[PDB]
């Protein structure tokens, strides 16, 4: 696991091509699509919501272990779009960064300083020829006390920005266009509902309407950001949201 | 190799109050060639000759490989 | 194994040093540059080392300014150490040895610069020298480095006289530059100019690194417009 | 006419899951002279055929003492056998002063596997090119181990390694029920080993200096015999 | 075209071909499996007998970590030994610091992180092993399979090595026909059946069946080997079934 | 010795005899030691807290100033206004911290705390708090001219007055 | 002849346009802020940065490289001058340290140049107002006006037409907004433009009052409303 001298060509190590491209970083973007999972994140009035597809085709898996939503600290969570080993690496890093910050600076790591820190780490992996980019997009969510409901997304180039809503995965462009046309209609920067029960409900509706497939309890995953608790829904709680979509319409 | 062998001889002399064995000095110049100073070869073939009270009069071929043999007689070079 | 660094300086504008019987005369020419690149700066051609020594440069300012600052530091340290200011020979040898090291040591690169060190001290009087990337240096009656070196040295050789005054060395530097100019006229904004002379009247070394108006005044003495 | 693209480094995998550079390091074991090891319940024996460069040359050392209760042999490479054997001596001394135990020969095996596998995983380095037969005695009885430069070690009743070893190995496999029952008699276990090594000498002949023997177990420290001491086993 | 020669590199697809090639090494290994029971885990393996000269009681394919984690692997033999040593010292580290046996999920993540690190740098290669490991802790039975990429999941039953296709297909029948979950005694018998069924693709070599188990009722949640009459009863079950 | 601090109804005050320990635009100190304070810790924390502000893009919290003091002193008073609101703290060589509606420290302390206890109000308006801080340090006096003061209101840039009495 | 730095310059020549203009009484630095998605909150990333209260920067090229550069440039402006001299640097000192940071990457093997060119603008007591371009090479140049990125050849032609020694800061802002208007990729408004000045001091932005010595930031990022007010005339 030490650094050492070794050789490479302009697309085997992160080096500028003749046209200024970094192929090793653009190929790490293609690694994010590998799991074939779509995810969606949206802001409520006093919460922020993250919905993931769940794929467990293999009947021999314990479905309880297959999980792309991660608890970084009491206030903050993330969804990973990419291979599970890189996701567990990024999660262990983000947990350690948040714990070290709460120790030094004396308040819980804001969601704008965790995305920045993780994006700065990814820039060091985009200029290093001895270490690769991670094949992951990280979407961080919390209900900050400085900016309120917050979505921040970080990618293998170490770019990051804050989001009104976002979708990540193989079919994300349709989810994104259907979200763009929702905010073009409602003219808010959030989903105008006062309870996380109605936002996790609206996000599941948009995920179904975009992907063209219904979800069993087990085909979906959920995150519910509230002040001093990020948490993930158990399948019987997600059943409430799914049963509240069938009864509504 | 020679100035390593010289520094190896004087350090053994002041440690044991006794002369270095010719095998042990031959071993030391071979270890230098395995270290490359500090699977590469290093330097040149040596004939190493000496007397010690244990193994008498001895002649060794020390090789660029960092390995050696004792000979009763040995020719090297042209 | 350095000759490419000597090729580098050959492009870098031109500097003329001329030694009189009673002074020295540095002149140098700024390369014409972009309208918006700032001229009012520290990166020029005619710099200084102490109140008795001046330099003109060919080659890149980024390699020049490190050596100029090392020379200023070493000259300040010598004046602080002995209360008499550094000899010109010891400055150029000290700067010739730093430059030699970075040429022979393969962990470093040869400095792509060549300075004309003019000066005065009482151990040898007025001293004009050139140093180049190889780390060798030579004493001169007149010298030039950089662009038009060859053409300028012929005009220097056929007009230079050992007995000449500083005022004749002003004329000869200006007339050499106006003979060998890349622009088909010479102007005060392209020209940097300095002298080292024997005081106002008493024994002191008097430098002038000339301001743009004083340059205009010597150009209109010398018949360059 | 062919150009293997996947054997340049110890860190490349073949498209078929092969570490060719580690296989070529196993091919280096078949460059050194034959060694045999065998064991019963009370004793374990090494025997080795020592080469020389010329008739004026001394004989190359094949057998090394790592501690009073264990030691090894070295076919393939001679200098790669001293890096491992020096480390095995250090780890035995360390076990005496830190734990007041003799190093277990299984524990010694894991420590060699550990050291060897690291070279197999890192750039710029090369897998060892030496095969060790380790013999020892400890509280579990007499033991023989075959170490392979990939980082693997095997518990055996007997084996042979070096050039033309299949002869001795085939004799041991045929003689197994006999040499494993040689208990309380060390000389017959040595003779069974010297007859096994005689099956690998294709037309060649043992001599006092061309033969080296070692034994450990029960009341006997690890001892090496070579020169006149092997005269009763020729 | 050179993306497959060194370990850090992504191919144009965004996959690491040196880890694709490391799992080809796993696919050449001896078949091994695990079964998650109602209160424990059973592990089984085909131990190929290479010669009469191997000392029969001291070559053991199943590996013990702490006292509650059982382990088995397929592929490179030095790499499996190294992950088992990392495992033993990683468990002994947690036992020294927290005075309590390591959670199987926490143990699994410490290995997953270790193996994933060997996919980051071109100064190293991946591990050429898949590890099946598992045990009993405060939360009951856990079974894990960890692969060359550092990828791991929890399983109901897991299979790796040369016979993995046939073993996966049989393990699916166990899960379909026993949807409540198997007893440890039946899982032992049923694991023997799956190793014999995996060996019929490889009948040219002799093998020894090796079984171990870790069950809260049968073994008090300590990992132990299946020895004597129960092993022979499970052999006789596998032998009547393979007819 | 110089210190009185008042956690008043819309902000906070600290007064001293002629401190200048501006940790940040909204965070201030006073202290006895004076040579380890000013230069050393208050210059050195002042760098780390401006870097923290530029890095995190948010105002620096007083709890961050406290954490950095406690770990960079490894007898000050600290006051300031966060997005959280107003704070007053004191720090101890034991490695501890406390919070009070008001405080004083050093040789004048018990006399000043009597003047504080005689006049505190939970609805204390800022001129009344400034007056209480002034007059409790005036009661602590028989360095320089008698009073200077720092005031940090919830909405506003801090006001320091180079003298007040 | 090309190497890794000519490729880092091509990353800069592909990047979003930015510019600097120096006036009689201050400096402008300005750029377009381009959004990856209309769901992205464009206030949450800053294109123009405060280094010290009297030095500011803008880039062109790879945005993540510039963010790590400015974090290091701020740390450099602190550990160097605030923590030993007690005061902030001249623009020349901080530009040399930024160029030292950029040269260290182009030098070390197993690192690549920073894929950004920087315009650094600021004030000093001795030098007055100044503007410098810092390239991936770790080289620095002083400028009267300049542009970097895609639009730079047309922008520098308009800056050559329009610069003179007598411009006021308010008219340099009009020239800057005219120069950004022609190169604009997205929409042109106070939410897509980012613009700062170093000019007169702003005692309100000191954020405290009393101590007569401190005067507050020379540096000021314009709010989007102030930009839109100027765009009504532009």
List CB contacts of C69: < 8 A, sequence separation 6 or more. none
Q: Where are the alpha helices (DSSP H) in A34-169?
A: 84-105, 111-124
What's the CA angle centered on G14, arms G12 and G17, to 5 degrees? 75
Angstrom distance (rounded) from CA A77 to CA E235: 50
The catalytic residue positions of E are: 30
Q: How many domains does chain G have?
A: 1
Enclosing domain of residue D141 = 4-234
What is the C-alpha radius of gyration for chain F, rounded to an integer number of angstroms?
15
What is the Cβ-side half-sphere exposure of residue E206, based on CA atoms within 13 angstroms?
Answer: 5
Instruction: Please give the helix or strand (H or E) that residue G141 lies within, else none.
Output: strand G139-142
Q: Which whole-number Å values give the CA distances from G101 to A197, C110, G83, G120, in the listed order?
A: 51, 22, 19, 14
The single-letter DSSP state of residue G82 is: I
How far is Cα of residue D72 from the mean position of the Cα atoms in its chain? 5
Domain locations along chain A: 8-248
The CATH superfamily holding the domain E1-243 is: Aminohydrolase, N-terminal nucleophile (Ntn) domain (3.60.20.10)
Q: Find which of D8, D9, D17 to mutate to test the E interface (most E CBs within 10 Å of its CB).
A: D17
Tokens 């310059």 belong to G9
Interhelix angle A172-186/A196-211, nearest 10 degrees? 130
Q: Which residue of F has its CA nearest to A147?
A: F58
User: Residue D141 corresponds to which tokens in the numbers above?
Assistant: 């009885």
d(CA D30, CA F103): 86
Q: How far apart are CA A181 and CA A187, in angstroms?
A: 10
C207 contacts C194 by C-beta, under 8 angstroms? yes
Using a 10 angstrom Cβ sphere, with 0-12 exposed, 13-18 middle and 19 or more buried, the burial of residue F16 is: buried
**What number of other Cβ atoms are within 10 A of residue D169's Cβ?**
20
Does G33 contact A at CB distance below 8 Å?
no
Question: Which residues in chain A touch residue E156, judged by CB atoms under 8 angstroms apart?
Answer: 59-62
List of chain F residues whose C-beta atoms are within 8 Å of the C-beta of residue G208: 22, 25-26, 157-160
Residue with tokens 């009069």: B57
For residue E23, the chain D residues in CB contact (below 8 A) are: 17
Collapse the DSSP code of A133 into the 3-class scheme (helix H, G, I; strand E, B; otherwise coil) and give the result: coil
Q: Do F157 and G86 touch (CB under 8 A)?
A: no
Resolution (in Å) of the shown entry? Answer: 2.8
CATH number reported for the structural domain that contains residue D94 in this entry: 3.60.20.10
Q: Which of F14, F46, F54 to substitute to test the interface with G, most G CBs within 10 Å?
A: F54
Residue of C35, C41, C62 with shortest CB distance to G160:
C35
Q: Which 8-state DSSP code applies to residue D25?
A: H
State whether A159 and G36 contact (CB < 8 Å). Answer: yes
Nearest to C36 among G92, G139, G160 (CB): G160
Structure tokens at D107: 């524990």
Angle between helices G91-107 and G4-14 (to 10 degrees): 120
Report the CATH number at residue G206.
Answer: 3.60.20.10
Helices (H), chain F: 41-56, 62-72, 109-117, 126-138
Give the minimum alpha-carbon distance from C89 to chain G in angstroms, rounded to a whole number: 32
**Residue D29 · residue D75 · CB < 8 Å:** yes
H-type alpha helices, chain E: 17-26, 77-98, 104-117, 164-177, 184-199, 229-242
Instruction: Specify whether the CB–CB gap between E103 and E137 falls below 8 A.
Output: yes
- Asked whether the beta carbons of residue D53 and residue B69 sit closer than 8 angstroms, the reply is yes
3-state class of E111 per DSSP?
Answer: helix
d(CA D72, CA E172) in angstroms, rounded, equals 49
Closest CA of chain E from D121, distance in Å? 6
Interface contact F51-G78, CB threshold 8 A: yes
Three-class SS of residue A54? coil
Q: Among partner residues A123, A159, A160, which is closest to G68 by beta-carbon distance?
A: A123
Handedness of CA G122, G126, G127, G128 (dihedral sign): positive
Contact at 8 Å (CB) between E21 and E140? Answer: no
Quick one: angle between helices B2-16 and B22-35, nearest 10? 130
| CA–CA distance, C89 with C139 (Å, rounded to integer) | 9
Domain, as residue range, for F44: 1-165
Which CATH number applies to A8-248: 2.40.30.10, 3.40.50.300, 2.30.42.10, 3.60.20.10? 3.60.20.10
Select which of F1, F42, F56, F97 is catalytic.
F1
d(CA A36, CA A171): 9
* CB contact burial G138-167 (16+ within 10 A = b; e otherwise): bebbbbbbbbbbbbbeebbebbeebbeeeb
Tokens coding A79? 């969804």
Residue D93 forms contact with E (CB below 8 Å): no
Contact between B66 and D56 using a beta-carbon 8 Å cutoff: no
Q: How far is B71 from chain D (nearest CA, A)?
A: 5
- DSSP letters for C36-95: TB--SSS--SSEEEETTEEEEEEE-HHHHHHHHHHHHHHHHHHHHHHSSPPPHHHHHHHH
The CATH number of the domain where C94 resides is what? 3.60.20.10
- Residue ranges of alpha helices (H) inside E77-146 are 77-98, 104-117
Number of domains composing chain F: 1
Nearest to G64 among A158, A183, A189 (CB): A158
Query: Which residues precede a break in chain B, with C-to-N distance above 2.5 Å?
Result: 38
Please answer yes or no on whether A165 and G110 come within 8 Å at the CB atom. Answer: no
CB contact under 8 A, G74 and F54: yes
Given a contact cutoff of 8 angstroms between Cβ atoms, the answer to whether G7 and A16 are in contact is yes
Q: What is the DSSP string of chain B?
A: -HHHHHHHHHHHHHHHSSPPPHHHHHHHHHHHHHHT------S--EEEEEEETTTEEEEEEE-TTS-EEEESS-----
The chains found to touch F (3+ Cβ pairs under 8 angstroms) are: A, G
Domain ranges, ordered by start, for chain E: 1-243
Choose among A105, A113, A145: nearest Cβ to F67. Answer: A105
Say if residue D130 is exposed, middle or buried (CB neighbours under 10 Å; 0-12, 13-18, 19+).
Answer: buried
Structure tokens at D121: 């995983």
Is residue C66 a contact partner of residue C109, using CB atoms and an 8 Å limit?
A: no
Chains F and G touch (3+ CB pairs under 8 A): yes
Chain G nearest-CA distance from C61, in A, is 11
Q: What is the count of structural domains for chain D?
A: 1
The backbone torsions φ and ψ at residue C85, rounded to the nearest 5 degrees and listed phi first, read -75, 155
Beta bridge partners of F104: F4
Q: Which of A107, A112, A146 sits opposite F63 (nearest CB)?
A: A107
- CA dihedral for D98, D104, D108, D113, sign (positive or negative): negative
> Nearest CA to A168 among A130, A138, A123, A205?
A138
The answer for residues whose C-beta is within 8 angstroms of residue E173's C-beta and 6 or more apart is none
Residue F150 with chain G: CB contacts under 8 Å: 210
- Residues in G closer than 8 angstroms to F51, CB to CB, are 74-75, 78
Q: Decide: helix, strand or coil at residue C199.
A: coil
> What is the rounded distance in angstroms from the CA atom of residue G200 to the CA atom of residue A172?
48
Residue C167 CB neighbours (<10 A) = 17
Catalytic residue flag (residue F1): yes
Q: Rounded to a whole number, what is the distance in Å from the CA of F47 to chain G's nearest CA?
A: 6
* Interchain CB contacts (distance < 8 Å): A and D: 5
Return the DSSP state at G79.
I
Q: How many CB atoms lie within 10 A of CB C150?
A: 9
Which candidate in D58, D62, D86 is best for mutational testing of the B interface (most B CBs within 10 A)? D58
Cα distances from A50 to residues A41, A68, A155, A220, C160, in angstroms, run 4, 11, 17, 10, 86
CA distances from D181 to D69, D177, D192, D196, D215 (A): 21, 7, 11, 16, 16
CA distance G225 to chain C (A): 31
Closest Cβ opposite residue F64 in set A105, A116, A146: A105
CA G49/CA E213 separation, integer angstroms: 63
Say how far apart CA G15 and CA F127 lie, in whole Å.
Answer: 55
Q: How far is G12 from chain F (nearest CA, A)?
A: 25
The number of beta carbons lying within 10 Å of the beta carbon of residue C32 is 10
Contacts of A166 in chain G (CB under 8 A): 37, 39
């Amino acid at each position: 696991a030490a650094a050492a001298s070794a050789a490479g060509y302009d697309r085997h190590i992160t080096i500028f091509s003749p046209e200024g491209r970094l192929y090793q970083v653009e190929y790490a973007f293609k690694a994010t699509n590998q799991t074939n999972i779509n995810s969606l994140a949206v802001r409520g009035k006093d919460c922020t919501v993250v919905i993931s597809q769940k794929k467990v085709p293999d009947k021999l898996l314990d479905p309880t272990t297959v999980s792309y939503i991660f608890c970084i600290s009491r206030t903050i969570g993330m969804v990973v779009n990419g291979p599970i080993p890189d996701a567990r690496n990024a999660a262990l890093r983000a947990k350690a960064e948040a714990a070290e910050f709460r120790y030094k600076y004396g308040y819980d790591m804001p969601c704008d300083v965790l995305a920045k820190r993780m994006a700065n780490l990814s820039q060091i992996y985009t200029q290093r020829a001895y270490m690769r980019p991670l094949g992951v997009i990280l979407t961080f969510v919390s209900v900050d006390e400085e900016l309120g409901p917050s979505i921040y997304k970080t990618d293998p180039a170490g770019y990051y920005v804050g989001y009104k809503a976002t979708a990540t995965g193989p079919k994300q462009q349709e989810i994104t266009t259907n979200l763009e046309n929702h905010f073009k209609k409602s003219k808010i920067d959030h989903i105008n509902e006062e309870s996380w029960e109605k936002v996790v409900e609206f996000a599941i509706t948009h995920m179904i309407d975009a992907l063209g497939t219904e979800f069993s309890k087990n085909d979906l995953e959920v995150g519910v950001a509230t002040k001093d608790k990020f948490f993930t829904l158990s399948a019987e709680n997600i059943e409430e949201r799914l049963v509240a979509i069938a009864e509504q319409d | 190799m020679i100035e390593h062998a010289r520094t190896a001889a004087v350090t053994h002399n002041l440690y044991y109050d006794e002369d270095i064995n010719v095998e042990s000095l031959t071993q030391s110049v071979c270890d230098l060639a395995l270290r490359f100073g500090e699977s590469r070869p290093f330097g040149v073939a040596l004939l190493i000759a000496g007397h010690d009270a244990d193994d008498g009069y001895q002649l060794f071929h020390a090789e660029p490989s960092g390995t050696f043999y004792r000979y009763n007689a040995k020719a090297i070079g042209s | 194994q350095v000759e490419y660094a000597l090729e580098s300086i050959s492009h870098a504008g031109t500097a003329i040093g001329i030694m009189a019987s009673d002074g020295i005369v540095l002149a140098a020419e700024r390369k014409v540059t972009s309208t918006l690149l700032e001229q009012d700066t520290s990166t020029e051609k005619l710099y200084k080392l102490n109140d008795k020594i001046a330099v003109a440069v060919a080659g890149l300012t980024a390699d020049a300014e490190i050596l100029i600052n090392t020379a200023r530091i070493h000259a300040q340290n010598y004046l602080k150490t002995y209360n008499e200011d550094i000899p010109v020979e010891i400055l150029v040898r000290r700067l010739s040895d730093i430059k030699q090291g970075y040429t022979q040591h393969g962990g470093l690169r040869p400095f792509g610069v060549s300075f004309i060190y003019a000066g005065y001290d009482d151990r040898y009087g007025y001293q004009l020298y050139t140093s180049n990337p190889s780390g060798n240096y030579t004493g001169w009656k007149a010298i030039s480095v950089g662009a038009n070196t060859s053409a300028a040295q012929t005009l220097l050789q056929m007009d230079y006289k050992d007995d000449m005054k500083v005022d004749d060395a002003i004329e000869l530097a200006l007339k050499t530059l106006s003979k060998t100019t890349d622009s088909s006229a010479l102007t005060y904004d392209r020209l940097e100019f300095a002298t080292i002379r024997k005081g106002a009247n008493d024994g002191e070394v008097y430098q002038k690194i000339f301001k743009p108006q004083e340059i205009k005044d010597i150009l209109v003495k010398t018949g360059i417009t | 006419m062919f150009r293997n693209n996947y054997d340049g480094d110890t860190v490349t995998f073949s498209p078929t899951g092969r570490l060719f550079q580690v296989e070529y390091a196993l091919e280096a074991i078949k460059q050194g002279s034959v060694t045999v090891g065998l064991r019963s319940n009370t004793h374990a024996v090494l025997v080795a055929l020592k080469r020389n460069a010329d008739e004026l040359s001394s004989y190359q050392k094949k057998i090394i003492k790592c501690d009073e209760h264990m030691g090894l042999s070295l076919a393939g490479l001679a200098p790669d056998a001293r890096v491992l054997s020096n480390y095995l001596r250090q780890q035995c001394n360390y076990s005496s002063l830190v734990f007041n135990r003799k190093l277990a020969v299984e524990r010694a095996g894991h420590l060699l596997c550990d050291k060897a596998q690291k070279n197999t995983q890192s750039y710029g380095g090369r897998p060892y090119g030496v095969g060790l037969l380790i013999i020892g005695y400890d509280k579990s009885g007499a033991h023989l181990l075959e170490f392979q430069p990939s980082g693997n070690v095997t518990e055996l009743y007997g084996t042979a390694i070096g050039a033309r070893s299949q002869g001795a190995k085939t004799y041991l496999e045929r003689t197994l029920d006999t040499f494993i029952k040689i208990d309380g008699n060390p000389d017959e276990l040595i003779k069974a080993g010297v007859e096994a090594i005689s099956q690998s000498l294709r037309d060649e002949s043992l001599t006092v200096d061309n033969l080296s023997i070692a034994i450990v177990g029960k009341d006997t420290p690890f001892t090496i015999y070579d020169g006149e001491a092997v005269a009763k086993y020729i | 075209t050179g993306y497959d020669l060194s370990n850090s590199v992504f191919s144009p697809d965004g996959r690491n071909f040196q880890v694709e090639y490391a799992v080809k090494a796993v696919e050449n290994g001896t078949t091994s499996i695990g079964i998650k029971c109602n209160d424990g885990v059973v592990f089984a393996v085909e131990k190929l007998i290479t010669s009469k000269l191997l000392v029969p009681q001291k070559n053991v394919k199943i590996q013990v970590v702490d006292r509650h984690i059982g382990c088995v692997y397929s592929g490179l033999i030095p790499d499996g030994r190294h992950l088992v040593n990392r495992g033993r010292e990683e468990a002994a580290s947690f036992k020294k610091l927290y005075k309590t046996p390591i959670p199987i999920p926490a143990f699994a993540d410490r290995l997953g992180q270790y193996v994933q690190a060997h996919t980051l740098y071109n100064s190293v290669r991946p591990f050429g092993v898949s590890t099946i490991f598992g045990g009993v802790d405060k939360n009951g039975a856990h079974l894990y399979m960890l692969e060359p990429s550092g990828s791991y999941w929890g399983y109901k039953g897991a299979a790796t090595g040369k016979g993995r296709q046939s073993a996966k297909a049989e393990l699916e029948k166990l899960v379909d026909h026993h949807p409540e979950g198997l007893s440890a005694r039946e899982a032992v018998k049923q694991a023997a059946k799956i190793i014999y069924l995996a060996h019929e693709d490889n009948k040219e070599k002799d093998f020894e069946l090796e079984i171990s188990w870790c069950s809260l009722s049968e073994t008090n949640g300590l990992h132990k080997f299946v020895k004597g009459d129960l092993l022979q009863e499970a052999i006789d079950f596998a032998q009547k079934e393979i007819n | 010795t110089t210190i009185v601090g008042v956690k008043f109804n819309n902000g906070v005050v600290i007064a001293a005899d002629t401190k200048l320990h501006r940790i940040s635009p909204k965070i201030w100190c006073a202290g006895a030691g004076t040579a380890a304070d000013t230069e050393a810790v208050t210059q050195l924390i002042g760098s780390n807290i401006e870097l923290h502000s530029l890095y995190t893009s948010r105002e620096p919290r007083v709890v961050s100033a406290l954490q950095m003091l406690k770990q960079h002193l490894f007898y000050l008073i600290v006051a300031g206004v966060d997005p959280t609101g107003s704070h007053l703290f004191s720090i101890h060589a034991h490695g501890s911290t406390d919070v009070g509606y008001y405080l004083s420290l050093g040789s004048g302390s018990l006399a000043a705390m009597a003047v504080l206890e005689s006049h505190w109000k939970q609805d204390l308006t800022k001129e009344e708090a400034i007056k209480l801080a002034s007059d409790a340090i005036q009661a602590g006096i028989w360095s320089g001219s008698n009073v200077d003061v720092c005031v940090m209101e919830i909405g506003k840039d801090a006001e320091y007055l180079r003298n007040y009495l | 002849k090309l190497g890794q730095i000519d490729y880092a310059l091509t990353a800069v020549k592909q990047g979003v346009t930015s510019l600097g203009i120096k006036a009689t009484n201050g400096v402008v630095i300005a750029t377009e802020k381009k959004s990856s998605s209309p769901l992205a909150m464009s206030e949450t990333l800053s294109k123009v940065s405060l280094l010290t209260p009297d030095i500011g920067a803008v880039y062109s090229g790879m945005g993540p490289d510039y963010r790590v550069l400015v974090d290091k440039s701020r740390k450099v402006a602190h550990t160097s001058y605030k923590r030993i001299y007690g005061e902030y640097p001249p623009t020349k000192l901080l530009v040399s340290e930024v160029a030292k940071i950029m040269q260290e990457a182009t030098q070390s093997g197993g690192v690549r140049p920073f894929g950004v060119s920087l315009l650094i603008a600021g004030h000093d007591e001795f030098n007055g107002f100044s503007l410098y371009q810092v390239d991936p090479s770790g080289s620095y140049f002083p400028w009267k006006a300049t542009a970097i990125g895609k639009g730079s050849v047309a922008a520098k032609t308009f800056l050559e037409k329009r610069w003179n020694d007598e411009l006021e800061l308010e008219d340099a802002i009009h020239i800057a907004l005219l120069t950004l208007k022609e190169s604009v990729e997205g929409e042109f408004n106070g939410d897509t433009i980012e613009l700062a000045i170093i000019g007169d001091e702003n005692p309100d932005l000191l954020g405290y009052t009393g101590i007569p010595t401190d005067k507050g930031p020379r540096f000021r990022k314009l709010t989007s409303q102030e930009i839109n007010d100027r765009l009504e005339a532009l």
